[PDB]
Amino acid sequence: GLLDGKRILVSGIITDSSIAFHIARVAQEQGAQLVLTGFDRLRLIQRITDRLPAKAPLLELDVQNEEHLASLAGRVTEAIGAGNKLDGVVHSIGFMPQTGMGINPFFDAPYADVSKGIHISAYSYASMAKALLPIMNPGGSIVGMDFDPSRAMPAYNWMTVAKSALESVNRFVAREAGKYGVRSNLVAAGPIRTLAMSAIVGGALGEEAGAQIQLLEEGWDQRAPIGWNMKDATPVAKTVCALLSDWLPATTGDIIYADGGAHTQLL
Amino acid sequence: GLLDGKRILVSGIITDSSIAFHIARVAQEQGAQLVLTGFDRLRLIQRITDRLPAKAPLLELDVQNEEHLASLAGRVTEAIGAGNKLDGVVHSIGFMPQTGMGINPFFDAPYADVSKGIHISAYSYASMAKALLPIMNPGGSIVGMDFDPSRAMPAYNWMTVAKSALESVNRFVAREAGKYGVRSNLVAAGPIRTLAMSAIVGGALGEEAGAQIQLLEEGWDQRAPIGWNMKDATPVAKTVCALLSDWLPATTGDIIYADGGAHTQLL
Amino acid sequence: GLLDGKRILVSGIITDSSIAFHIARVAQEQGAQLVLTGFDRLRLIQRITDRLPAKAPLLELDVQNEEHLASLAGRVTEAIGAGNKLDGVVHSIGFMPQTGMGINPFFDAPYADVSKGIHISAYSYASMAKALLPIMNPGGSIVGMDFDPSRAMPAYNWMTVAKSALESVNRFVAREAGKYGVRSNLVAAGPIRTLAMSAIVGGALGEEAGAQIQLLEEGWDQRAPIGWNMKDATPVAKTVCALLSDWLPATTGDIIYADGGAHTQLL
Amino acid sequence: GLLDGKRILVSGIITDSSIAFHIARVAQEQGAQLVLTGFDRLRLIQRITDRLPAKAPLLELDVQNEEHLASLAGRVTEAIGAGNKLDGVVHSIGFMPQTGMGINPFFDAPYADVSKGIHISAYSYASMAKALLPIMNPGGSIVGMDFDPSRAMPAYNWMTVAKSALESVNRFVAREAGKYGVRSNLVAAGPIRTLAMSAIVGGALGEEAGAQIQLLEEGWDQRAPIGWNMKDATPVAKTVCALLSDWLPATTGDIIYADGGAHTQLL
Numbered sequence A, B, C, D: 001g002l003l004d005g006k007r008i009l010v011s012g013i014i015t016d017s018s019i020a021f022h023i024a025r026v027a028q029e030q031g032a033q034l035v036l037t038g039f040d041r042l043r044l045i046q047r048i049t050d051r052l053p054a055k056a057p058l059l060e061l062d063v064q065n066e067e068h069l070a071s072l073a074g075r076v077t078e079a080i081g082a083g084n085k086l087d088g089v090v091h092s093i094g095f096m097p098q099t100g101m102g103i104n105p106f107f108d109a110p111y112a113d114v115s116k117g118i119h120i121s122a123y124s125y126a127s128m129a130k131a132l133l134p135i136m137n138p139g140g141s142i143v144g145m146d147f148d149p150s151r152a153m154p155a156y157n158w159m160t161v162a163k164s165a166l167e168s169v170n171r172f173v174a175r176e177a178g179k180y181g182v183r184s185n186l187v188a189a190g191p192i193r194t195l196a197m198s199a200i201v202g203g204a205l206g207e208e209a210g211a212q213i214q215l216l217e218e219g220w221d222q223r224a225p226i227g228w229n230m231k232d233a234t235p236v237a238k239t240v241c242a243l244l245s246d247w248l249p250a251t252t253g254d255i256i257y258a259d260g261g262a263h264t265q266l267l
């Protein structure tokens, strides 16, 4: 097993399409012992997490909630047992109010909405690192999920800004994590048919932004030298497990692109 | 005159060291007619703006204030006269609470503070574009001030994240501005001895972060193939005027580095 | 005049569509005194250079030719007069054998051909800097022409590799040039209908690479927030003159994108 | 074993410090069956390759030699047996004449020398891909070794240009490789004490370039959030094996930084 003997916390499962679900599945297949965290609808998440290869504790974590964050290391320790620490942490979380995305004009998003999006999508990467680094082993790994925001694009709007902020946060988390002998990296994935995406795609069913999204998806597979299948989160899940393993031990503050190589090609 | 006949709004003057003061000075020398905006201490700003080569209207603008933003185009029109529009807009504004910078630990900044910093330093670039694009001429230019956040560094901390967000915002502002035939770009300047910097440098007088800042300054001039003088904002002011002119007409969504070429050299 | 009183050498004129022709035209309109250099068909070039706003000396320069390079500073000095030096130098030169481009398979280009292309397109930027820096004034400017090679693309093939090398050469030329108080930068232009392009486009009239090139052109104007007109070299010529002026005095080793902002947008 | 059952060709072994030696060692520990290639001093290389965990065929390959390249797939097939194909290929090869590096002035390198360096260090990545892709399995992986050339630096000089070219070549190799279901990536390593480096460091023992190299090494470990040990090629070897494995299946045309995260930090 790639992750045999490792204890890994995975946030972000909401459906069986969640990138986090597939990260969790592949990690368990590779021998990892998981602790899962979920937001809002815990009973629902439990039903999904029951479909994984193996049992795992499920803890509540709303990254907006300072009490949840303050108690997290303690609750995790209770789950994995005193004297044990985490080897990995996966941040697979994001949010942006509907005003900040889709067909909504970029200029019409109130800062209150943008700020909430940045809180959950970017700042919380630092929040989770702050909470969990004190219970991580040397050689450990923190991984977050990114969508390449180096260029602007239709529809993604303020989430692009939140991802740009996340990339910057990741470089600073790496400075802190290094003191614990821990790496911090992001995986920039290509588009995957998840609940999050269905909210975006669904919000523009018939408008120009919806058409633009479909064009972006077609262009992605065309540009990717090895192609890109939006229906398959496995290549992304494997990439996250690679960073969680001991096989990328000199990479930190960085971004690994699991996108079919699309970002390396203009056309 | 490089900017002969152009009407240009300049935000961000607070002292005679302000990058905005030097942008304003050089622009007037090149024939521009200015409208200035100021925050908080208007009487003080007036005293400084009296030391410019020419007279210019001074309007109050707190970019946190939705009423100030909603009335800005109207107030500007009153200043420059009905039937007239702006050819340029300079955003030279930034803020980050003390908890988000200096020697303060990266993990100890409350999101309330980070959010305020991002509001003023990044979101407000979009706010100003939204307010002013309806009164800009085709061929016009919006310019904001940046500090290269591509890599993490000591002390700059959450302001780095705010600049990463600003770069992303600028790429989206360019999409909107293009509909008006208007360009949007940032100037990434090297370090300049201003009031803002004095707040940072001063906040660490004797701590490791203070030493790190001095090291960064020495490294900057060393790396710059043409050198770098932190005591001189003129090269930066000229670069902004270049983007405000008609001489970079095919550049938008972009970043021009006025940093002595330091970002192009490793050592 | 933007370049009033400046003495500027411009290489690369071959037809009235040459980017160099338009750089030369705009520079003269802005008061520059030019020295032109030409390759191979000097009588032909003379006929074109006669259509510029003002007269200018024309010197032969084959950048492959070590004797031409060794005598260049001397020949230029003879042209502009003893005691006078250059304020600017424009490298607007490129070449790649047909085996290295178009529909030709990437793997089928012999190194002898690739090497010749890199010699003329990249190494010669250093050659010209070496020859001319000893006769340049402090505050001077060297500018070369680039086509963004950060990502691979159809048809451009080995020329992309040559441009990647040129970008690297430019960063090293900046180190040397800085000793003379001289800047070195590239302008990355979007596609322009020139003789060079006609050789590429023409070499694939009816093949997949030809179709791919047309798609790239359509995508360019779509992505550019201010649009892109391939029939108009003026915005590019103005950008080069901006770098030749005193208005970008803190930029060196760098690349300015005159591409309608296309490189800042994914779609 | 990470690479259990995979057949992998590894070029570039010359001493027990060679990055390729450590790639080969770690790959064998992970169950790979290797084919090694060597240049010039085959008896010497044999003596070193005898110190690996397991036996492996050693074939002669001078990447300058068109006959060696034309016969390589045939010779490899003879080594691994008819009906068998390669799963991996490692390019760990570089060369630059002494005129192109060290204390030698950048402008004094003859193109004949630069061209030879680019041939071996960059073009040959395409040469090896061309020769070996016809005998690679789908899901296969080609990996080359890089040193981040995004910025100029002392001493590395024309090798920096060769690496910039290599990065561009890699993006085009990925386009070709994708047709075979094969990935192509580079690993950008931090500095490692090898024979190659000893040639550079040794060539400046007492000159400014030698001092600059020592400063670069100290700065590297300082900037790396997890530190950097130039005496240890293992983290780099593991990173290459990660790309050779099935665990980064959606990454191609790309660069993975095994540098302690140094390239993500300014200071």
Ligand SMILES: NC(=O)c1ccc[n+]([C@@H]2O[C@H](COP(=O)([O-])OP(=O)(O)OC[C@H]3O[C@@H](n4cnc5c(N)ncnc54)[C@H](O)[C@@H]3O)[C@@H](O)[C@H]2O)c1
Pocket (backbone or CB within 6 Å): A011, A012, A013, A014, A015, A017, A018, A019, A020, A038, A039, A061, A062, A063, A064, A091, A092, A093, A094, A095, A120, A145, A146, A147, A188, A189, A190, A191, A192, A193, A194, A195, A196, A197
């Ligand atoms: N689906 C894609 O195409 C794609 C591509 C690149 C990157 N990503 C990123 O991958 C990650 C997961 O996205 P996904 O596509 O699997 O979507 P998803 O809908 O399956 O999962 C997103 C998760 O965010 C969690 N979340 C939202 N608010 C939270 C809060 N206040 N506290 C704690 N958790 C909260 C949700 O509960 C949910 O489980 C995100 O960072 C996303 O931006 C997705």
Ligand SMILES: NC(=O)c1ccc[n+]([C@@H]2O[C@H](COP(=O)([O-])OP(=O)(O)OC[C@H]3O[C@@H](n4cnc5c(N)ncnc54)[C@H](O)[C@@H]3O)[C@@H](O)[C@H]2O)c1
Pocket (backbone or CB within 6 Å): B011, B012, B013, B014, B015, B017, B018, B019, B020, B038, B039, B061, B062, B063, B064, B091, B092, B093, B094, B095, B120, B145, B146, B147, B188, B189, B190, B191, B192, B193, B194, B195, B196, B197
């Ligand atoms: N000084 C440097 O080294 C340096 C380097 C690169 C970029 N910058 C950027 O240049 C710009 C100007 O900085 P400066 O160095 O001239 O500092 P400065 O102190 O001289 O000016 C900063 C301005 O921000 C304005 N501001 C703060 N909050 C505001 C609000 N709520 N509404 C409207 N205005 C507000 C201030 O009133 C002030 O005039 C900033 O974006 C800064 O980050 C500075």
Ligand SMILES: NC(=O)c1ccc[n+]([C@@H]2O[C@H](COP(=O)([O-])OP(=O)(O)OC[C@H]3O[C@@H](n4cnc5c(N)ncnc54)[C@H](O)[C@@H]3O)[C@@H](O)[C@H]2O)c1
Pocket (backbone or CB within 6 Å): C011, C012, C013, C014, C015, C017, C018, C019, C020, C038, C039, C061, C062, C063, C064, C091, C092, C093, C094, C095, C120, C145, C146, C147, C188, C189, C190, C191, C192, C193, C194, C195, C196, C197
């Ligand atoms: N046309 C575009 O779309 C475009 C876009 C971006 C960058 N560029 C670059 O702009 C520059 C000029 O290209 P252009 O489009 O105006 O093409 P052009 O055909 O009008 O000019 C190219 C020049 O290269 C010169 N040249 C070729 N070999 C030479 C040698 N051995 N010695 C001296 N000069 C030599 C030619 O004589 C010619 O004048 C090149 O570097 C090119 O790659 C062109």
Ligand SMILES: NC(=O)c1ccc[n+]([C@@H]2O[C@H](COP(=O)([O-])OP(=O)(O)OC[C@H]3O[C@@H](n4cnc5c(N)ncnc54)[C@H](O)[C@@H]3O)[C@@H](O)[C@H]2O)c1
Pocket (backbone or CB within 6 Å): D011, D012, D013, D014, D015, D017, D018, D019, D020, D038, D039, D061, D062, D063, D064, D091, D092, D093, D094, D095, D120, D145, D146, D147, D188, D189, D190, D191, D192, D193, D194, D195, D196, D197
């Ligand atoms: N050592 C470092 O610090 C470092 C850092 C980043 C990247 N790299 C890269 O790693 C790779 C290997 O370098 P290394 O440090 O292990 O040095 P090395 O001296 O141990 O190996 C370099 C190899 O190049 C081979 N080579 C040279 N000319 C050849 C030719 N004509 N045909 C076939 N092979 C030839 C040599 O025989 C040798 O085995 C290179 O691409 C190098 O640039 C090294």
Ligand SMILES: CCCCCCc1ccc(Oc2ccccc2C#N)c(O)c1
Pocket (backbone or CB within 6 Å): A092, A093, A094, A095, A096, A146, A147, A153, A154, A155, A156, A159, A190, A191, A192, A194, A196, A197, A200, A213, A216
């Ligand atoms: C123009 C867009 C086309 C391709 C989109 C790929 C993509 C899909 C879903 C993503 O997830 C979120 C998106 C927005 C808000 C919250 C989340 C979360 N969690 C993501 O980040 C990127």
Ligand SMILES: CCCCCCc1ccc(Oc2ccccc2C#N)c(O)c1
Pocket (backbone or CB within 6 Å): B092, B093, B094, B095, B096, B146, B147, B153, B154, B155, B156, B159, B190, B191, B192, B194, B196, B197, B200, B213, B216
């Ligand atoms: C590690 C740092 C060393 C060099 C710093 C250069 C620099 C100085 C001042 C700057 O201005 C601000 C900084 C923080 C918060 C608000 C503003 C404002 N306005 C800036 O953005 C960058």
Ligand SMILES: CCCCCCc1ccc(Oc2ccccc2C#N)c(O)c1
Pocket (backbone or CB within 6 Å): C092, C093, C094, C095, C096, C146, C147, C153, C154, C155, C156, C159, C190, C191, C192, C194, C196, C197, C200, C213, C216
């Ligand atoms: C896929 C391509 C589509 C757009 C191309 C834009 C473009 C056109 C012409 C160019 O000039 C050359 C090209 C090749 C060889 C020599 C020269 C020269 N001189 C260039 O560099 C870039």
Ligand SMILES: CCCCCCc1ccc(Oc2ccccc2C#N)c(O)c1
Pocket (backbone or CB within 6 Å): D092, D093, D094, D095, D096, D146, D147, D153, D154, D155, D156, D159, D190, D191, D192, D194, D196, D197, D200, D213, D216
């Ligand atoms: C300023 C430099 C300090 C750090 C250097 C790291 C480094 C060391 C050795 C390298 O290998 C070569 C270098 C030159 C020519 C051939 C090869 C080969 N093979 C390399 O690419 C990079």
